[model samples]
Target: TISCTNPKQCYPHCKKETGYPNAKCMNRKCKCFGR
Candidate 1:
């Protein structure tokens, strides 16, 4: 799990690290909440 103050800053990192195939930033934070 990761906690980021900036979703924009976190999104690329999240996708790079998690290798989520399809990742994007919607809210203020990046999370796999619904997935």
Candidate 2:
């Protein structure tokens, strides 16, 4: 995912795939909520 300052920025992006607004930084990018 794109580089963002906080989880909120990536929440929407990952929400589509995971259907959950979870976020964390990985490789300088956001990996959305997905167990």
The clash numbers for all candidates, in the given order, read: 0, 0
Over all chains combined, what TM-score does candidate 2 have? 0.52
- Residue-by-residue lDDT tens digits, candidate 2, 1-35: 47787777777777776787787766577776673
TM-score of each: 0.37, 0.52
**Which segments of model 1 are wrong by more than 4 Å?**
1-4, 21-35
Tell me the deviation in Å of residue 6 in model 1: 1.0
Worst 10 residues of 2 by lDDT: 26-35
User: How far does residue 22 in candidate 2 sit from its true spot (Å)?
Assistant: 0.9
Residue 10 lDDT in model 2? Answer: 73
lDDT of 2 at 32: 68
